[PDB]
Design a binder for this molecule. Structure first.
Ligand SMILES: Cc1cc(NC(=O)c2cc3c(COc4ccccn4)nn(-c4ccccc4)c3s2)n(C(C)(C)C)n1
Ligand SMILES: [Mg+2]
Ligand SMILES: [Zn+2]
Length: 313
């Protein structure tokens, strides 16, 4: 009960900001995640020994890939933490509990290949799940770890509540399928415009949680420019490896994934900010006004990519 986590002074201050970077010391990331759960949820909501065992099994089941790794998991969870702390009264105790777990687990056992590549490869997972292929794999990896001995962090919930939180976690993990984002943001835009958006309608909540999951997942585009720029190397290292794997199947990859067309990267980023990121953080800010800093930092990075194109860095 009386065993609270502390951070060094700089981290204790900067962890509250949306643009926090968790740093290069892997061995601090678990303690950072627990601190976030304790302040977002209470020191009571999880048994520390089960939580710690859960965290280390989740880490063990992330792979050594350039971008979709353990650091991305904790980074995505930190963005969710920033959102929840800035919208303190909007979310139930179960939602606070579930969403941080969802973010830590959202890319479990990722191998750095898109749903498209699994389909063209004819991967067994694509036969099991025709849509959101990796995302249904990420959720079933989460259930697996929750069912290991000593790992049920939800042990003290009723059958009913346990089922609700696993249902919040499933929808949250599925929503990280960016193919689903486009329609989800379109629907929320319409509902906010006509004033029909209602946070007591469970199907409206689900959509808003869906958009938060996209916002946390893309949060690399909302860091300070030097972090955004270095993370972009990791993202493209996976894209180019997938492009190589397409070429091995006898398929010219889209130019984004072609390491022969690296010259097109800055214009590709410009495309992605205009088509995906800016609309995402725009609609999110309309619904949750305190998330404004995410939109502002996204516009800043858009401006920095325009400077790269115009040869100004
Ligand atoms: C339905 C869907 C959607 C997507 N594409 C994507 O998911 C992404 C694209 C990008 C880019 C660059 O985008 C562009 C856009 C057009 C031309 C060149 N490049 N940067 N980041 C990024 C940047 C920062 C942080 C996270 C992600 C992302 S995530 N696919 C594929 C088939 C997997 C590509 N299928
Ligand atoms: Mg994913
Ligand atoms: Zn992700």
């Amino acid at each position: 009960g009386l065993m609270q986590f502390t951070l060094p002074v700089r981290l204790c201050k900067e962890i509250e900001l949306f643009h926090f970077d968790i740093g290069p010391f892997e061995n601090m990331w678990p303690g950072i995640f627990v601190y976030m759960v304790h302040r977002s949820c209470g020191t009571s909501c999880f048994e520390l020994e089960k939580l710690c065992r859960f965290i280390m099994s989740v880490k063990k089941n992330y792979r050594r890939v350039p971008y979709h790794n353990w650091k991305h998991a904790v980074t995505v969870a930190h963005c969710m933490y920033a959102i929840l702390q800035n919208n303190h009264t909007l979310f139930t105790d179960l939602e606070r509990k579930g969403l941080l777990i969802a973010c830590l687990c959202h890319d479990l056992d990722h191998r750095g290949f898109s749903n498209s590549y699994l389909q063209k490869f004819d991967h067994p997972l694509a036969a099991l799940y025709s849509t959101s292929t990796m995302e249904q794999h990420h959720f079933s990896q989460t259930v697996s770890i929750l069912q290991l001995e000593g790992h049920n962090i939800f042990s003290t919930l009723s059958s009913s509540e346990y089922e609700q939180v696993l249902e919040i976690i499933r929808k949250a993990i599925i929503a990280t399928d960016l193919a689903l984002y486009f329609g989800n943001r379109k629907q929320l835009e319409e509902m906010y415009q006509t004033g029909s958006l209602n946070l007591n309608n469970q199907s409206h909540r689900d959509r808003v949680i869906g958009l938060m999951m996209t916002a946390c997942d893309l949060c690399s585009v909302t860091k300070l420019w030097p972090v955004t720029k270095l993370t972009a190397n990791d993202i493209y290292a996976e894209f180019w490896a997938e492009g190589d794997e397409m070429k091995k199947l006898g398929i010219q990859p889209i130019p984004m994934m072609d390491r022969d067309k690296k010259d097109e990267v800055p214009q590709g980023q410009l495309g992605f900010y205009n088509a995906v990121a800016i609309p995402c953080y725009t609609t999110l800010t309309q619904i949750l006004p305190p998330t404004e800093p995410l939109l502002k930092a996204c516009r800043d990075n858009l401006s920095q990519w325009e400077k790269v194109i115009r040869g100004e860095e």
